Design a protein around this ligand. Structure first.
Ligand code: CLA
Ligand code: CLA
Ligand code: CLA
Ligand code: CLA
Ligand code: CLA
Ligand code: CLA
Ligand code: CLA
Ligand code: CLA
Ligand SMILES: CC(=O)O[C@H]1CC(C)(C)C(=C=C/C(C)=C/C=C/C(C)=C/C=C/C=C(C)/C=C/C=C(\C)C(=O)C[C@@]23O[C@]2(C)C[C@@H](O)CC3(C)C)[C@](C)(O)C1
Ligand SMILES: CC1=C(/C=C/C(C)=C/C=C/C(C)=C/C=C/C=C(C)/C=C/C=C(C)/C=C/C2=C(C)CCCC2(C)C)C(C)(C)CCC1
Ligand SMILES: [Cl-]
Lengths: 37, 450, 34, 214, 163, 50, 33, 59
């Protein structure tokens, strides 16, 4: 368990690790925005 | 947009990152941003595991993959592998997160607003992929950095609180490695020994003294090499066997890192020293030896004369003889007789498994350890059912050793494939026929028939 | 059986050195275009 | 200054004053007067060059330290202390630890070599005090092209240039090495043979016994 | 008074009136002072570390009182006889008023650019050594009190290989 | 077998005889490549100069 | 009330839509996307 | 306080991340608005130092 100070901020930590995967996708969505130039 | 289109470049969108081969600043930005991504994942995952931590269960049952490393470094761990507090892990996570933010900003700045080519404005960070002196200079600088890192690990283990040692007297605990082994022969015996059974090329390091000595040697070698490559220039013999281009360097790195990934995968599956079983769970052979040991003890309690009961095949169902003559556990686990675990060594003599120690001087803690390891073997399923494939799903456990080994073996092979692909393409592009044949200078038509 | 080990150790180092020094002998230059 | 590659040397350090003129002189005490410091037999005449006097200083130190190296190995390895004394094993062959060898040897031989180097520097001063112009490390006759002793030096001026380079470099590197060996032995109470030979061996703790196999 | 003595940490660190006023009337005197202090404290730190592994074998009071036995650290001050340290200081004061050895002359040339940079680096280093002397004395005295009140017992808390 | 072993040489004969094969190769390779110090081509994997 | 669910869905929420918001703004302000 | 202090830090980091990537891209935008970004960076590092000081003291 997190220290008692940050147990309130726990839900952000619940999603933080999966962020990078989304960066990947962003590349794809960015390429889609520019018409796969 | 001049550099960002299949026309200006000749590279499709899917193979779009290849447009950065000759662009120095943007390539640096991409590299830095990617490093920031690595650091961010490290910090985020450490925080995640600290959040989901439960003090009742051992770390290898909670599906944790990073707390084990920091515990092996000697952070918040007590005797026997008990976790005292999880504050240092939280500190490491937050520091990594902040540093990742900084690195990500730097990568974005260098990719977007930074000059495309560093050669014009900063003729110290600019390169050409073709001159050898600057390439070797960069290689030597980073080599010195790696040597300093290896030194830092040695320093941490020797004078910064020490590291966790399973083979420590009185049980596993944090201790200072006062006298590392510095003998070059014993250190390089690992490097130059066979990779087959009973040898364990670099996976078979036993004590922490060998680990510390090997790291001292690696740091010294890396420092010397980094100084040497900075000053010198590639020699004649190496100047005509290597392809000098960016993709060729990438292919070399890919082959090396695939080998390293294979080594780490097999290293997490067999080693007890740098991968204590109290944190990663028992290894493959360790579970089998634990099963044989606990059933031997149980049958001995009933009064059966162990080491005198012939097995169904007449071979001996409790104690056997190894093909080298050593006395080992019987059954199918005779293939794992090379095992050496901290909870089974007390029973081993020069001749092998001592019998007088087994008959009389047995310990309850050994029984508990063997039962726990047998009940938690590195067996599981993709959905983490746990146990044997035919077992019903009530337990929920897959050993972190299995996860690490499988994932890193997969990654290592695909990086070997990357090496093949990139080496072939780099050499073809350097030669000058990576796009087609020619249709007017077809070399097949100029060669003798056959 | 030490003799058999000696002969095999020769054959192996023989062919391995052949490989190593064949690829060191300016192989990238060996190519259709020059 | 390529030795200290990203740095500037003295406002007047030379490149041809001494063979070892790569420019390495960070504090570059060459700048300082480097004269008869505390009346070092002041002459005010030719007086060589203050840099050239520091050069003669480096030459003397490196030559002595070079000989010192061999005197730290051969007592152990080469000749295994051929002390072959008529009697008195101590102060002789027996002390192979160089520090302990000095600890034993009587002041007879100490005064012998002391007077030896004393006559050496007496002749050196006798030359240099008159040998103005190019003091040239107080060369005088010592193996000079005239070769004041046997096999009077028979080489070429280009070979002489390379030989000056050889000597200067070896003297500098040996000045490092003598420090090496001395701090080694003092901080190990041994001789170089001891640590180097157990190093190139396999520790007795692990030997896999022998091939006692059938 | 914005002369040499400033760098990236602060362009003129004087969070008081101290700097302004006595313009070149106390600034030079303070430069003399801070210089002497920082040099001496550098020598102090070198002092503390060097008695820990090496020891000159001289008998301060001949017959007995041999360096090899006197404690390092603050204790030596209690040990060193009042008049003994008086004579030591008297030598130092003669040195300050005679330049006896200690590079009595000779400072090379050092063109004004490199000379200024060296002087600035000197100031910075001696300033740092003042704080180093501070921590050392602190630890020493505190341990002298409750033997390991600080915790880490060995005198030089860093440089663990020494102790 | 499982005796660790530097490389796998167990008998000085085995090492001293795995020696001449590699040295034979070094000699035949040196026969072509000898007295080479310079000739820096400075190009992408050219090594055109022999 | 499983505030955990109402805490874990909406944060996954903000995070998933954020980068696409950056894409919004870049295409709106005629940026060098 | 810590809990709150950080909450803020999270909010200011979100406001910074949503606007830095848009700035850099939009040509020119950067320079013109450099000093406000510097001020917000100093605010960010001050918040981090304040959070660290909280914990320490509180332990
Ligand atoms: C780690 C992955 C990674 C990295 C670092 C890069 C990096 C880069 N790619 Mg790229 N790429 C990737 C994956 C990656 N790529 C993948 C997976 C594909 C396949 C779809 C491509 C396909 C591709 C093509 C086809 C091209 C590039 C190009 C480029 C370069 C210029 C990009 C540009 O102008 O952005 C412009 C895009 C934007 C401005 C929109 C993105 C907005 C930001 C950057 C998103 C991140 C914001 C972040 C979350 C906020 C954090 C703030 C911080 C302070 C905390 C740059 C070096 C181009 C090139 O060659 O340059 C010469 C090019 O033509 N890439
Ligand atoms: C450090 C490692 C490394 C680096 C720097 C590169 C760099 C490069 N590679 Mg490459 N490669 C690598 C490893 C690496 N490779 C490995 C290990 C393999 C073996 C699989 C390959 C196979 C490969 C091929 C076959 C090709 C390249 C090409 C290229 C060039 C352009 C790539 C590009 O634009 O990406 C664009 C990136 C993408 C389009 C992303 C695709 C996403 C993949 C397909 C799925 C990833 C799955 C992931 C693990 C999990 C998915 C999660 C999902 C379920 C949500 C570039 C020089 C191209 C080339 O020749 O350029 C000259 C090319 O054709 N590479
Ligand atoms: C491997 C990492 C790496 C490398 C090689 C570089 C390299 C470079 N950076 Mg840099 N940078 C990095 C990480 C890195 N950065 C990170 C992580 C950040 C975020 C904190 C930045 C933020 C940054 C800024 C804000 C600027 C640079 C600039 C520069 C260039 C000149 C730097 C200089 O004068 O240094 C001199 C040092 C020794 C001689 C140079 C190409 C400058 C540039 O190119 O713009 C003009 C510049 O203004 N960098
Ligand atoms: C990441 C590690 C790394 C990498 C990529 C290289 C890469 C290289 N080394 Mg090497 N080297 C390293 C670490 C490394 N070194 C270390 C740590 C040492 C110290 C023992 C050396 C000592 C060394 C020597 C003595 C020589 C090389 C040489 C070479 C070149 C040819 C390599 C070959 O054919 O085999 C190549 C540039 C050769 C070369 O071309 O010299 C310039 C060569 O003769 N290396
Ligand atoms: C030992 C006593 C002493 C004395 C006489 C001075 C005297 C001086 N200091 Mg100073 N200083 C000292 C200790 C001392 N300092 C210590 C221990 C530190 C470390 C905290 C500093 C840090 C310091 C800074 C950072 C600066 C001065 C500056 C100055 C000068 C103007 C005030 C003046 C020459 C300023 C200056 O030279 O202008 C300046 O910028 N000092
Ligand atoms: C007893 C002789 C003596 C005399 C006459 C002076 C005289 C002076 N000292 Mg002084 N000083 C002395 C011994 C002496 N010092 C000793 C023994 C030390 C300790 C090493 C110092 C350390 C010292 C500092 C740090 C400073 C002076 C400053 C000064 C000047 C005010 C003045 C010229 C200030 O600038 N002194
Ligand atoms: C490389 C060996 C080494 C090791 C293991 C340590 C170990 C340690 N040092 Mg240390 N230190 C070293 C070299 C080393 N130091 C050197 C060379 C210096 C001079 C720059 C210092 C200066 C130093 C200081 C100033 C402090 C430590 C401190 C410490 C302790 C906590 C960190 C720890 C016992 C701290 C106690 C502390 O305040 N060290
Ligand atoms: C205001 C005073 C103050 C106090 C009392 C502390 C106290 C502490 N800091 Mg800290 N710190 C401070 C200011 C302070 N800091 C400031 C101003 C900064 C810069 C912004 C930092 C940056 C900092 C870092 C980066 C780290 C610390 C850490 C620590 C802890 C290490 C000692 C330890 O393990 O004890 C035992 C303490 C515990 C078991 C629980 C805590 C300790 C509790 C370390 C830490 O918390 O690691 C666990 C750590 O990594 N501090
Ligand atoms: C007529 C007449 O008299 O004229 C004379 C003129 C003259 C010039 C005297 C003549 C000559 C030529 C002479 C005398 C040339 C002498 C040259 C000499 C004697 C040069 C020694 C170098 C030693 C070095 C550089 C250091 C090596 C060793 C080093 C740097 C080490 O690394 C030692 C190391 O040990 C440590 C530090 C630790 C160990 O863990 C590891 C090792 C072992 C690796 C003649 C021909 O006699 C004629
Ligand atoms: C170029 C490019 C790219 C890339 C980019 C990159 C790679 C970036 C990175 C980025 C990054 C890498 C970032 C990072 C960030 C981070 C951050 C932003 C952090 C933050 C943190 C925080 C906020 C924390 C907080 C806390 C605390 C303090 C305590 C506990 C709790 C918590 C955790 C909450 C792409 C592909 C897209 C596309 C193309 C172009
Ligand atoms: Cl079985």
């Amino acid at each position: 368990k997190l220290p008692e100070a940050y147990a309130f901020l726990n839900p952000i930590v619940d999603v933080m690790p999966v962020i990078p995967v989304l960066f990947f996708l962003l590349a794809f969505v960015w390429q889609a925005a520019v018409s796969f130039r | 947009i001049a550099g960002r289109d299949i026309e200006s470049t000749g590279f499709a969108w899917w193979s779009g990152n290849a447009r950065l081969i000759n662009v120095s600043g943007k390539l640096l930005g991409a590299h830095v941003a990617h490093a920031g991504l690595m650091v961010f994942w490290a910090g985020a995952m450490v925080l995640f595991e600290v959040s989901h931590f439960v003090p009742e269960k051992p770390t290898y049952e909670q599906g944790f993959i990073l707390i084990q490393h920091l515990a092996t470094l000697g952070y918040g761990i007590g005797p026997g592998g008990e976790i005292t507090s999880t504050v240092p892990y939280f500190a490491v996570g937050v520091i990594h997160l902040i540093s990742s933010a900084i690195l990500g900003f730097g990568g974005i700045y260098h990719s977007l607003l930074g000059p495309d080519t560093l050669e014009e404005s900063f003729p110290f960070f600019g390169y050409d992929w073709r001159d050898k002196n600057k390439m070797t200079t960069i290689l030597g600088i980073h080599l010195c950095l790696l040597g300093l890192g290896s030194f830092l690990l040695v320093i941490k283990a020797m004078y910064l609180g020490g590291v966790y040692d399973t083979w420590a007297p009185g049980g596993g605990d944090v201790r200072y490695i006062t006298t590392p082994t510095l003998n070059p022969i014993v250190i390089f015996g690992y490097v130059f020994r066979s990779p087959f059974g009973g040898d364990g090329w670099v996976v078979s390091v036993n004590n922490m003294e060998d680990v510390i000595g090997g790291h001292i040697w690696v740091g010294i070698l890396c420092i010397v090499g980094g100084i040497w490559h900075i000053f010198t220039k590639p020699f004649a013999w190496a100047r005509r066997a290597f392809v000098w281009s960016g993709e060729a360097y990438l292919s070399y790195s890919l082959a090396a890192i695939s080998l390293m990934g294979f080594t780490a995968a097999l290293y997490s599956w067999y080693n007890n020293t740098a991968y204590p079983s109290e944190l990663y769970g028992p290894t493959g052979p360790e579970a089998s030896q634990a099963q044989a040991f606990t059933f031997l003890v149980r049958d001995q309690r009933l009064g059966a004369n162990v080491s005198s009961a012939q097995g169904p095949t007449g071979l001996g169902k409790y104690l056997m003889r190894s093909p080298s003559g050593e006395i080992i556990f019987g059954g199918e686990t005779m293939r794992f007789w090379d095992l050496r675990a901290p909870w089974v060594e007390p029973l081993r003599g020069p001749n092998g498994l001592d019998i007088n120690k087994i008959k009389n001087d047995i310990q309850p803690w050994q029984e508990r350890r063997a039962a726990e390891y047998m009940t938690h073997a590195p067996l599981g399923s993709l959905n983490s059912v746990g146990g044997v494939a035919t077992e019903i799903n009530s337990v929920n456990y897959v050993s972190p050793r299995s996860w690490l080994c499988c994932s890193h073996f997969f990654l290592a092979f695909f990086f070997l494939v990357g090496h093949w692909w990139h080496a072939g393409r780099a050499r073809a592009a350097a030669a000058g026929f990576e796009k087609g044949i020619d249709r007017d200078f077809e070399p097949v038509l100029s060669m003798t028939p056959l | 059986m030490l003799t058999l080990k000696i002969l095999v150790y020769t054959t192996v180092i023989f062919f391995v050195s052949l490989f190593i020094f064949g690829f060191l002998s300016s192989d990238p230059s060996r190519n259709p275009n020059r | 200054s390529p030795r200290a590659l990203p740095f500037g040397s003295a406002p007047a350090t030379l490149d041809g004053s001494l063979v070892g003129d790569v420019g390495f002189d960070p504090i570059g005490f060459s700048t300082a007067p480097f004269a008869s410091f505390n009346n070092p037999l002041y002459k005010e005449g030719d007086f060589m060059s203050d840099l050239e006097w520091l050069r003669e200083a480096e030459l003397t130190h490196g030559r002595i330290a070079q000989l010192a190296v061999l005197g730290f190995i051969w007592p152990a390895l080469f000749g295994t202390f051929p002390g072959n004394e008529n009697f008195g094993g101590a102060d002789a062959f027996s002390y192979v630890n160089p520090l302990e060898a000095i600890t034993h040897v009587p002041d007879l031989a100490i005064y012998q070599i002391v007077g030896g180097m004393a006559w050496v520097e007496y002749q050196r001063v006798i030359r240099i005090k008159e040998q103005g112009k190019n003091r040239v490390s107080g060369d005088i006759g010592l193996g000079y092209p005239g070769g004041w002793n046997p096999f009077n030096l028979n080489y070429s001026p280009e070979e002489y240039a390379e030989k000056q380079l050889q000597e200067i470099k070896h003297c500098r590197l040996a000045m490092i090495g003598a420090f090496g060996l001395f701090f080694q032995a003092l901080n190990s109470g041994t001789d170089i043979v001891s640590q180097l030979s157990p190093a190139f061996a396999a520790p007795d703790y692990a030997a896999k016994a022998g091939y006692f196999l059938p | 008074e914005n002369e040499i003595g400033a760098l990236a940490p602060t362009g003129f660190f004087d969070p008081a009136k101290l700097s302004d006023g006595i313009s070149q009337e106390k600034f030079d005197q303070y430069r003399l002072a801070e210089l002497k202090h920082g040099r001496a404290a550098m020598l102090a730190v070198l002092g503390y570390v060097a008695p820990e592994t090496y020891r000159f074998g001289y008998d301060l009071i001949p017959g007995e009182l041999s360096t090899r036995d006197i404690p390092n650290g603050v204790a030596a001050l209690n040990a060193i006889p009042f008049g003994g340290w008086v004579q030591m200081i008297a030598f130092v004061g003669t040195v300050e008023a005679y330049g006896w050895f200690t590079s009595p002359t000779g400072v090379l040339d050092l063109p004004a650019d490199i000379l200024a940079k060296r002087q600035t680096s000197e100031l910075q280093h001696g300033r740092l050594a003042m704080l180093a002397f501070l921590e050392l004395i602190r630890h020493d005295s505190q341990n002298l009190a409750q033997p390991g009140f600080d915790g880490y017992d060995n005198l030089i808390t860093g440089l663990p290989f020494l102790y | 077998a499982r005796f660790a072993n530097g490389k796998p040489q167990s008998i000085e004969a085995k090492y001293i005889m795995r020696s001449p094969a590699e040295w034979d190769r070094f000699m035949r390779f040196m026969d072509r490549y000898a007295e080479a110090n310079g000739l820096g081509f400075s190009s992408x994997x050219x090594x055109x100069x022999x | 009330d499983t505030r955990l669910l109402v805490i874990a869905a909406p944060v996954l929420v903000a995070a998933s839509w954020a980068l696409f918001n950056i894409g919004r703004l870049a295409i709106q302000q005629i940026q060098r996307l | 306080m810590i809990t709150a202090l950080t909450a803020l830090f999270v909010l200011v980091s979100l406001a910074l991340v949503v606007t830095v990537p848009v700035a850099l891209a939009t040509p020119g935008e950067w320079e013109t608005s450099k000093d406000q970004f510097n001020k917000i960076f100093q605010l960010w590092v001050g918040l981090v130092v304040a959070i660290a000081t909280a914990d320490g003291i509180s332990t």
